[PDB]
Amino acid sequence: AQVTCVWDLKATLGEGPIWHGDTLWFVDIKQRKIHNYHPATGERFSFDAPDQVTFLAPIVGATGFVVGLKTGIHRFHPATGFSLLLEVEDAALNNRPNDATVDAQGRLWFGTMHDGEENNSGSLYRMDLTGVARMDRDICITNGPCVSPDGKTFYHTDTLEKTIYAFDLAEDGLLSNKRVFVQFALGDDVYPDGSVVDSEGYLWTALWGGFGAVRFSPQGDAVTRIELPAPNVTKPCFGGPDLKTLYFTTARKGLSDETLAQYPLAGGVFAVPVDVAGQPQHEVRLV
Ligand SMILES: [Fe+2]
């Protein structure tokens, strides 16, 4: 299939794409923006955030999004802006939220990270109507929380360790039986960024420094690799009428001026048709 650059956005750190309301929502973390792309018309919308904004999730029974800001978990509405829901960590850590997913029970799983990308201060959190629980700890850069279609397996990535872990996910939301799922040896400077799981239970992982994304079987073997004209690919997101259009956010962060001249579409939004559909986006049950 041919890859299309559908938005030559040149984002600094495009991240956190979701498919919602039949359109693509995502963020630019470092430019502090929420973006919205309508594939049917090409319309583009952008919203300024008061701090770094790192993930978006729709809410059950309500309008707007729950979003991760460096200053805490907020509610966002285009008309009214940002309102604090919960501060999850002590500001002195210089942490920020990063990636997130919503499981089929309406739980929001999100990670935090050292914004300086040096300390092992990040954690994994599970947020729902029973509160916020810390589920894993001591990770420098968390990434790519996601769950299988049957709801029994949970994946989480420690990016700088180049490792995706798998867990048993119980019906009551507890994790057990952590094990290595995939350890990356695709290059000295290739790291796993964000991941999603498709309708067959295969994991799609975007590669920082790896110019694309890899699809893994539930047993952890790579079965296909997509190439993009962008060194840093941050996250996949299934969209389109059949959830068979795979979108990718990318990042210019970390690339020299010479590399950006060579790969000027770095930071753009890319799209490619794939054969197996993704999973439908779930909504957070906040109350
Ligand atoms: Fe990420």
Side-chain angles (χ1 to χ4, degrees), residues 1 3-74 76-284 286-287:
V3 177
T4 305
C5 180
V6 300
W7 188 355
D8 186 13
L9 173 63
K10 307 192 190 302
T12 296
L13 181 43
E15 259 290 2
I18 59 170
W19 187 253
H20 181 72
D22 300 326
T23 74
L24 185 71
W25 289 84
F26 62 103
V27 300
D28 185 338
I29 303 192
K30 296 302 179 180
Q31 294 195 32
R32 299 162 155 202
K33 291 180 186 160
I34 294 175
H35 296 290
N36 183 212
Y37 173 69
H38 296 202
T41 56
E43 310 166 272
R44 312 185 272 221
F45 303 86
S46 299
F47 304 92
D48 296 319
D51 217 318
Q52 294 179 73
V53 56
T54 76
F55 71 77
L56 317 161
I59 306 150
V60 167
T63 56
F65 295 121
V66 54
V67 304
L69 300 190
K70 178 156 189 204
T71 49
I73 309 309
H74 289 63
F76 164 73
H77 295 82
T80 61
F82 298 78
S83 178
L84 179 85
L85 292 183
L86 192 86
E87 227 186 353
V88 64
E89 288 177 340
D90 183 29
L93 297 171
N94 199 1
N95 277 10
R96 64 162 172 92
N98 194 31
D99 210 1
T101 191
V102 183
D103 71 27
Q105 306 304 310
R107 313 190 195 94
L108 174 71
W109 299 80
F110 68 94
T112 59
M113 70 173 280
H114 184 221
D115 198 26
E117 289 158 36
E118 283 280 14
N119 305 338
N120 295 346
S121 49
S123 293
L124 175 68
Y125 294 97
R126 185 201 67 220
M127 181 171 170
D128 62 357
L129 39 62
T130 73
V132 183
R134 192 186 189 193
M135 310 293 309
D136 208 350
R137 50 178 299 160
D138 297 325
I139 298 147
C140 184
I141 304 186
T142 58
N143 246 318
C146 46
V147 303
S148 63
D150 71 3
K152 302 142 118 63
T153 309
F154 178 82
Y155 306 90
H156 195 233
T157 296
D158 173 341
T159 284
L160 295 186
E161 297 308 303
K162 295 182 189 175
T163 304
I164 303 181
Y165 294 95
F167 303 75
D168 279 14
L169 171 60
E171 286 194 350
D172 67 347
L174 281 187
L175 301 174
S176 59
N177 292 320
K178 188 180 180 179
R179 69 273 192 182
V180 171
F181 182 66
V182 174
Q183 180 175 343
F184 287 75
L186 304 181
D188 303 336
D189 308 302
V190 180
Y191 301 77
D193 207 335
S195 295
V196 295
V197 180
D198 71 17
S199 64
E200 288 185 345
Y202 286 55
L203 196 73
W204 278 97
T205 303
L207 304 180
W208 191 276
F211 288 88
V214 175
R215 185 183 190 230
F216 296 95
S217 75
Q219 303 78 3
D221 305 309
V223 299
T224 200
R225 177 171 189 166
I226 304 282
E227 304 278 351
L228 301 184
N232 295 339
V233 182
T234 56
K235 194 167 193 191
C237 173
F238 284 95
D242 300 316
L243 301 191
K244 286 193 203 171
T245 303
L246 193 49
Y247 290 89
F248 296 97
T249 45
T250 66
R252 295 167 79 88
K253 176 177 176 290
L255 301 176
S256 72
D257 292 318
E258 296 67 40
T259 301
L260 292 175
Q262 181 185 6
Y263 295 102
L265 302 186
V269 180
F270 296 82
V272 69
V274 293
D275 271 344
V276 173
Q279 297 186 75
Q281 174 69 40
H282 302 305
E283 301 179 319
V284 185
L286 285 185
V287 66

